[PDB]
């Protein structure tokens, strides 16, 4: 959905990570939601 | 919030009187927890006085 803090990307499980952690070659989400469509 | 918001008749009475102003709140979107609001402990406030 939407993270409360503006500059964040939301994982599959609802955990918000920074937007510069999406598609970086390092796993951060459970089951790699930042590592799917890069 | 004062003395005796918890009142058990003896130390091992297994029947206590509780008037602690406990109110349940609505949980955050996407989180499994029980939020609640209540007046703080009056035995601690009595120890502070």
């Amino acid at each position: 959905n939407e993270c409360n803090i503006p500059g964040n990307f939301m994982c599959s499980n609802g955990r918000c990570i920074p937007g510069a952690w999406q598609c970086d070659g390092l796993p951060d989400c459970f089951d790699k939601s930042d590592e799917k469509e890069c | 919030g004062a003395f005796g918001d918890i009142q058990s008749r003896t130390v091992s009475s297994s029947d206590l009187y509780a008037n602690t102003n406990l109110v349940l709140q609505r949980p955050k979107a996407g989180a499994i927890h029980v939020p609640y609001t209540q007046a703080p402990s009056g035995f601690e406030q009595w120890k502070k006085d």
């Binding site: 920074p18 510069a20 952690w21 | -």
Partner: protein, 159 residues
């Protein structure tokens, strides 16, 4: 899309500046601190340092690393090797160029330090780092639950 944002700090380099409180005394520091902007609410500060974040030691992309000048020869370390603290220990979120986004509690100074193999580097500057609640209850640490409210925090992305 993040790389077109990022590519402008390829034009630059880290530098060595003067920190008045190094690990021993006054020295010339690879990680000297220019400003600490804490005007948002929930404890997020924005450091500007004499180092760079996100570039490798040559100039290209790399994930969570600090890049710093060391007497001419630009070196690098990972970002989980860099700690910083105001009064309590802080938590680094991300870095992008000369800037860093931490999460610090309030305190009357800010100290950044990393550790080499046996050489410890530090910089402490007397800049007030402050914490700002939202609304009419003056918490010191943000709560576990409550009513949602509008705020104004530092954005995590480097847009």
């Amino acid at each position: 899309s993040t790389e077109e944002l990022f590519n402008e700090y390829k034009l630059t380099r880290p530098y060595m500046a003067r920190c008045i409180r190094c690990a021993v005394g006054s020295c010339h520091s690879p990680i000297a601190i220019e400003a600490v902007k804490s005007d948002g609410h929930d404890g997020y500060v924005r450091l500007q340092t004499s180092s760079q974040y996100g570039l490798d030691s040559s100039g290209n992309l790399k994930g969570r690393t600090m890049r710093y000048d060391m007497h001419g020869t630009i070196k690098e370390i990972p970002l989980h090797q860099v700690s910083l603290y105001t009064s309590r220990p802080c938590h680094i979120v991300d870095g992008h160029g000369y800037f860093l986004l931490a999460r610090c509690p309030a305190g009357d100074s800010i100290t950044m330090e990393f550790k080499k193999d046996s050489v410890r580097h530090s910089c402490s500057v007397p800049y007030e780092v402050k914490f700002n609640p939202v609304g009419r209850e003056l918490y010191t640490h943000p709560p576990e639950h409550g009513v949602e409210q509008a705020c104004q925090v530092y954005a995590h992305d480097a847009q």
